[PDB]
Amino acid sequence: PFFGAIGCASAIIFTSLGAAYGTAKSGVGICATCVLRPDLLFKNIVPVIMAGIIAIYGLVVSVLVCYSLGQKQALYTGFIQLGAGLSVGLSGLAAGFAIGIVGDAGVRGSSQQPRLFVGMILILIFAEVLGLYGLIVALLLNSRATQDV
Amino acid sequence: APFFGAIGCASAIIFTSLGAAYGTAKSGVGICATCVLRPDLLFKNIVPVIMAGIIAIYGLVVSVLVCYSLGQKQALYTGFIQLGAGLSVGLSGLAAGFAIGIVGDAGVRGSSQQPRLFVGMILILIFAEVLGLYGLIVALLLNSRATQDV
Amino acid sequence: APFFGAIGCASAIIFTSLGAAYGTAKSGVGICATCVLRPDLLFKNIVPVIMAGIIAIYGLVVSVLVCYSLGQKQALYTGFIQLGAGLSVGLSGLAAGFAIGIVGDAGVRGSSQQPRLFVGMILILIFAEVLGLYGLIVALLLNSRATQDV
Amino acid sequence: APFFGAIGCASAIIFTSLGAAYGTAKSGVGICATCVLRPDLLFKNIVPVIMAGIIAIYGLVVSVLVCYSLGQKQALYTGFIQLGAGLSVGLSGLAAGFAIGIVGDAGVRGSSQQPRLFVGMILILIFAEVLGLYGLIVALLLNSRATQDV
Amino acid sequence: APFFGAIGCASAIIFTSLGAAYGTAKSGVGICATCVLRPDLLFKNIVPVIMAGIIAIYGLVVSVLVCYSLGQKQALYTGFIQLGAGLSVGLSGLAAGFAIGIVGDAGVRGSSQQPRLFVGMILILIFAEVLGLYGLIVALLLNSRATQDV
Amino acid sequence: FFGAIGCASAIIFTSLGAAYGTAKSGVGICATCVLRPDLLFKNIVPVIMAGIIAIYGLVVSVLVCYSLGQKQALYTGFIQLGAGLSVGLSGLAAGFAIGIVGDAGVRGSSQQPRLFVGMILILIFAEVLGLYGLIVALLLNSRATQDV
Amino acid sequence: MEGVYFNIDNGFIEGVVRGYRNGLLSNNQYINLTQCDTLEDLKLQLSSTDYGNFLSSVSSESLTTSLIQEYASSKLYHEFNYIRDQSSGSTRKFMDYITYGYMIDNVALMITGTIHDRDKGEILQRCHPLGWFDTLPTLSVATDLESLYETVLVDTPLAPYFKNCFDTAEELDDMNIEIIRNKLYKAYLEDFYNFVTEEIPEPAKECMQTLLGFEADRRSINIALNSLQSSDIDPDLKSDLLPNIGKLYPLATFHLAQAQDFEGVRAALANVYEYRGFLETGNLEDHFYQLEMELCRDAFTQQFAISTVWAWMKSKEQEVRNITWIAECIAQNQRERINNYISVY
Amino acid sequence: YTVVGVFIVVSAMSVLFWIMAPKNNQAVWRSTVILTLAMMFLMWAITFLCQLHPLVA
Amino acid sequence: AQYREINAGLPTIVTFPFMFAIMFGHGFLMTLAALSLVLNEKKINKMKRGEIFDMAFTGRYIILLMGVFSMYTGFLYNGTENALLFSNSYKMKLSILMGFIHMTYSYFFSLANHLDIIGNFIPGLLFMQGIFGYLSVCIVYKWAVDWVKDGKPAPGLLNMLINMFLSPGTIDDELYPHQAKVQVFLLLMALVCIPWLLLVKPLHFKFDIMIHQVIHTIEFCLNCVSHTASYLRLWALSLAHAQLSSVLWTMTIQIAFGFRGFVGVFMTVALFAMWFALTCAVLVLMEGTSAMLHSLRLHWVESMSKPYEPFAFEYKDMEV
Amino acid sequence: FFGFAGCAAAMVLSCLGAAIGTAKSGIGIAGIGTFKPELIMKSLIPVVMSGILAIYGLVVAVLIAGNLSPTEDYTLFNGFMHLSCGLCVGFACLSSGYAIGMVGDVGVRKYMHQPRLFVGIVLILIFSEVLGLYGMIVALILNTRGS
Amino acid sequence: MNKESKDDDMSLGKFSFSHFLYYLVLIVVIVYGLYKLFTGHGSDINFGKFLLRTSPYMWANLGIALCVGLSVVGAAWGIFITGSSMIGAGVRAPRITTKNLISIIFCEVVAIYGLIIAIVFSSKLTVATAENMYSKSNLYTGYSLFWAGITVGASNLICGIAVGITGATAAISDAADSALFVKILVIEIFGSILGLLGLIVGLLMAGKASEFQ
């Protein structure tokens, strides 16, 4: 065994890829929305900062899972961390993938009408429950991996 | 023993979070496009985002129950019912979110022009969530047999 | 044995939930467009989503019946008929849901112009449940012989 | 002794160099397209290439620090650590370079007609480098325990 | 021993030669003449071929350094530590060669019309050309400790 | 022993290439026959020329099938795969080339009777690749029966 | 990029497409023939090129306007219909899709001209998949959408004119030839983006994407400049969708299309092409011809690429229009004014 | 042994542009000698015999 | 951009050419080619040869100062270098101490401007001054570690990488052992700089500040690691250019002198001409690729100091 | 017997790269109506230059096949170095032929377009030939250091 | 062993999907099989600590028939685009497009090239032509004939494809038979000599694999 390091890095890699795709999808709609009028550029920056907050859960989960790692690697310490990191990584990647399209659609629709910032901010801000549930499942899965031989 | 049963608990929340993310994105795209033309239908069209995002609680509760039913020791035959129930709940939540997003986009686009299809659009989106409840019930029935071995 | 019979239980509800979600999305995509042309056909268009969603109960019933047969102990020959019954009911439910989606969308678009064409679209969706009924009967007959000991 | 962690040090600089090269190409395409219309924003738009190319220094310093902590005995407490620690910084640098490419191309194309979002694009890249820095911190934390294997 | 790790020296110039070939191939493509000639762009466009070929020049030195440290017969410890340096220079040389190819094609097409874009177009490939040396330094650092195996 | 698929691979590849060349020659002959009823006899050369390649794979499959089931070992089922792949690749390439060559020769011969001699010359000269591949399969099948 | 895939039909179709383009006339022959003014010298000078076979098949003692359209119409049938009969697969499907894309607006012009007492014999030469003896007489004479749906469905494969006929059957496009031509041009650009999106990653396409992207903005600027001072409708489909979403917008093309003196958007979008903000239609057409000619000469020399087939298809229509305007200008005993500047690009 | 002794010997026996300067360009001429001398001090070239035995391993 | 005296391009005239000349004796060709365009500037202005050579001919003082300063650092590399992992261990740690003086000089120059009536500069350069000060102090003490209480794994980045991860430890390795409180005082001084940065803004502003202090805190936190992380390009390009020059010179010098007679003059003349021809293009490629210090000094150095005023101010400084 | 796969697969990439480079370079010599002045005047350098890539893999495969023998030291197992030695020259010859084909097609296409940029296609195309020499030099250096 | 039927099944399955790729849409090659094979090989090769490789045993003979089959299959595909060029021209001119059939002789010689080496590479046996690992040792001599014949067959297929690719553009190539077509024929000869050079270098580097006993 001794292969739990890729599962530990997959939580920050999936949240970093989902946050990068959400920031790219937010900047893609913000680049087209900024061409119409330079009066709502500060309002469209909320999707990149909201999508970038999902990487802190995978980073703190990767640091907490890395802090409980033992000196001897075996089969009991290289199987639960892969699913625990893959759960928070896939949850942050799905939340970043939905936050990218939600930030792109809200950033594109926010150019013509500035009143959609409440609904786009609420629908875009309502995607953190998947990453929080994935980090909560990764904490419970990481809590049962102690005493590795 | 391998002790690799956490992939079944992670696959349920991964599939439910992916289906809820795709349904929330597909419902938020048509909700944003229909909300750009008029903001009065935002509160009526806001139900599909919560309905698509509510499917993640089944995979999160199934992963929490599968993680709570794991224990300190595992065997080789322990990681089967969690993988089947996790894959079934993940596929059911992904199909329910995929149908919920396409139903929410056409519901918001058709409801943007004339505000009369909200009864059928709310009934289709409220009726398409039964697959996640059936897969969560099958994941609970498969999870009930995982608290006796080991 | 490994006791890996959960894939046959989850494979029926996965393909059944995916085909039911695809059929409900296919009927909900055309229901919102057909509801704008005639307000009287709004309540009549809800029958294809409920008719397409009825095929999901076969994989949930076969997975719920096959879920109790696992238990804690297993063997080398127990766990093979459930995969064939689950994949057999899942493929027929996914194909019946996929054909029921395009048949419901084409039946709603053709029924939007004239009301006499709704009997053909309802007849195709009513006639497309024979594959799911035969696959559910074969999955029930295969699931009935799987439980012999324990 | 047997070890397989040698590819983990070289795997770290691959994703950051590929994402930095793709971000430099996507930023250079919009900078070259915007430099033809007005030569005043050409010197201002050149900062995102050098700012995007600084993400490879974290993977190169992590690869040099992981290569400096290499011992003479290979075991299970040294192998597989540099692959995940370098793979996390490589995937974070590849995602930050991939977002910096679309952010630089969209910022250069939107700033080509009317430059008003240059500080927003530079703040988007400066806020996008923190995703690579967060992966680099976990790669340094996992890379710090790659020595003393028995 | 196993005698695995000899492909690391030959694998170095593969991605670097493919990236330099893609950069030199993509640099000549594009508009270079419009009516009868260009504004001295023929003498300026020759820099991206040598700039893309610099990583291929360093890849032969890295592959020669790995080939000198390969040897006829060595232990399994030096073989596992020797492999891995070629993929780091190969991936960064391929990504920097692809970014130098796209930046050379866009800088050649945009530089064909206006000659003022060659200053930023040369600085884009000059700033993107360090990806091969950044991986070559890590490959030389890992290859420097692969000698004197026991 | 796994050389049973080698005897069927030659007739499978030659039947597939002859089927595709006969389909393209029949489509080109049917499309060229609508413009004039005099080119029907001239347009039938590509289907008859492409359909003659099945006899080499059938005779090679019968000859390779004749040495199976009586004398076989762990080293006697290797030549049938190379001979069947050899005749199958040459028959499949010659059928696909003879189909487009027959369609282009029928389209060029439909305008005037000038390209029909060139298409009939190339179609008559394209059988050397099938005969050279058939001679290697006959020479490989004739040299068998070495290890019991 | 290119040269890494194996294509059997693409090599013969690319060689047969490059063989007709190599034997065609050049800019030196058009510049030399444009300077001279004589009906007898035009037949002798034009006999050396590839059009000397069709022009030499039927000719009289005087220059006629009917023989000029019959020469390019006879050369277009052998240059376009001859390659489709000898080809098959995705190359013949894309080549038939391009001829169906040009036949979407070319058949729409005959369908709109059918109400004005127009037939198959009263239409000019245009790019199509077949001649006007199989599908053009029944499609041009057929005024009902039910017969045009079965006539378009009878051809293999399915063309994009069925959706335009279905949208035009309910009166969803326009009541004039302007809105039907703009919606047909936008649907033709959407179909070219659909086939160019489908068969895109066979080779490495670089000049085809820039030629289609510049041709979309040149077609939108030409459609907005054509309706300038014509009182066009801002809420009507007259703005073709382009790949640029940060330089050219639909509101700027719709506002610039109306007679309000709003040509500053073309000057803001300028500095990258041959067009510029002005008030002369001849200078805008000459700059649009030189802008469309850019990236077209590179496709005539490069081989093993899918963009060279579309660039040769547009270069055949541009060379047929330039040869028809050059022959029509000298056929009337006059000197070209706008065709002389656009004779070389 | 180190270059800190040579840089301390240069800094000890050197004013380092202190204190006055010329009239024309007194700021660049004043800080230029201190920046070049401080750049040379960090560029003192402290060679081997602290990390000697090169050409290893 | 109308600053005449300060502070736009004051430290860029020394920090620019000194840090730019470290990437490039190979510096004699840049000083000869840079000094050759002095008298021939009027005739070379109307020759019309190249676009980068015209901008290099306009900035004759920048290429003359950087070309003259590049010969000093270039002559030392091409200290000695005879093997691998010997010369790079000192040239790698030399760029940290070389860039730390310009980093502290930019903070002192930024702290000198705006002259409580001062603030927003006391918290900056406190965490990086402690971490980078202990890393530069460990690199300075690492070259004196003889006897055995020393080591070169690497030093520099190895001590800072091992530090900040163990409070109970003292140093690993080659650090000042007096005894363990260096990391505690560094972590306390770096952790105390968090509230003092945002707290010192309203006291220094007087005799919407929250978002500016948070964005300046995160931008200072990212630029503090990016500014120290961007220093590797000088030693990377210097070691790559020195290895690329010494490989061709060592691979051509031995073959040039062999086969005495006419073959040594012809083969040595052709090999020396091709070697010098490739060496001039390699030095021109490194000089063209040495703009990273100008870009990072123009954006990152100009962001914490105060624009294109330092580029014209650096050339206008040597002219007046 | 495992060492013969590298020598047999050594020139397989150089022959496929030189064949595609010669076919891609020869495919662009069709146009455009001038054969006396410029086609071929200086466009024959890529076709003849691309054929020299197979000689390095063929000579390296003949030297690697002649160097190894069944009675020599082959009980290691150390025969995996011949696969990297042959694949190193094969990938460099294939990339050099693939870049030489696109450089010859771009130089032949841009040669007839402008009469002033003819030296740029030759100067840019001349640098592409040095790519395949590194795999042959590394293959000969790896074969010289072995048995 | 198990690799005996897997090698023939994979060899037939690769040519089946490769031949079905250019055909009508009935089947297609699995692109995920390469990433699944690389991930499955690197995953099992990475963990655990063990040498992962293959072992050839006895057969060693598929390169002999595969060389002549690959040369005949490569030579048979070049004549399609070469012969279709003259029919593609048609009535455009009576020029050298009907007299440029010299490339078809080299394309027909490309099928004999490799097949002559495969015919001369066996004598006095059909099961084994050298020392095999079924009744003796020294199986490298019989093992190298498979890779040498596969390399010579692939080189003959590439030269045969390059000959037809040169001839199909080298039919007439300007507009007619007024300009000489020898410029494309020079590149066709330069891409035609690679089969003879690769066959001479592969035959010389391959060694002797006949007269087994």
Residue numbers in the entry:
A (entry chain V): 10 to 158
B (entry chain W), C (entry chain X), D (entry chain U), E (entry chain T): 9 to 158
F (entry chain a): 11 to 158
G (entry chain Q): 1 to 345
H (entry chain c): 5 to 61
I (entry chain b): 400 to 423, 427 to 480, 524 to 560, 567 to 658, 710 to 808, 816 to 829
J (entry chain S): 17 to 163
K (entry chain R): 1 to 213
Share the article's original sentences.
The protein SidK, secreted by Legionella pneumophila, interacts with the V-ATPase to inhibit acidification of the phagolysosome in the early stages of infection. V-ATPases pump protons across a phospholipid membrane using energy from the hydrolysis of adenosine triphosphate (ATP) to adenosine diphosphate (ADP) and inorganic phosphate. Successful pathogens can subvert host defenses by secreting effectors that target V-ATPases to inhibit lysosomal acidification or lysosomal fusion with other cell compartments. This study reveals the structure of the V-ATPase:SidK complex, an assembly formed from the interaction of host and pathogen proteins involved in the infection of phagocytic white blood cells by Legionella pneumophila. Removal of the C-terminal residues 415–573 of SidK did not significantly affect V-ATPase inhibition by the SidK mutants, but truncations of the N-terminal region of the protein has been demonstrated to prevent V-ATPase inhibition. These data show that binding of the N-terminal domain of SidK to the V-ATPase is responsible for its partial yet specific inhibition of V-ATPase activity.
In order to understand how SidK interacts with the V-ATPase, purified full length SidK (residues 1 to 573) and detergent solubilized and purified intact V-ATPase from S. cerevisiae were incubated together and the resulting complex analysed by cryo-EM. In the absence of ATP, V-ATPase adopts three distinct conformations that correspond to different rotational positions of its rotor subcomplex relative to the rest of the enzyme. Particle images were subjected to 3-D classification in order to separate these different conformations of the V-ATPase, as well as different occupancies of SidK binding to the V-ATPase. While V-ATPase particles decorated with SidK were found in all three rotational states of the enzyme, the highest-quality cryo-EM map was obtained for V-ATPase in rotational state 1 fully decorated with three copies of SidK and reached a resolution of 6.8 Å. The distribution of particles in the different rotational states differed slightly from the distribution observed in the absence of SidK: 49%, 23%, and 28% for rotational states 1, 2 and 3 with SidK bound versus 47%, 36%, and 17% without SidK bound. The fitting shows that SidK binds the V-ATPase A-subunit primarily via its first α-helical bundle (blue bracket) and the three copies of SidK each interact mostly with the corresponding N-terminal region of one of the three A-subunits. Surprisingly, comparison of the V-ATPase:SidK3 and V-ATPase structures revealed no major conformational rearrangements in the V-ATPase upon SidK binding. In comparison, the C-terminal region of the ‘open’ A-subunit in the V-ATPase:SidK3 cryo-EM map is well defined (yellow densities, and 4B, surface versus mesh), indicating a more rigid structure when SidK is bound.
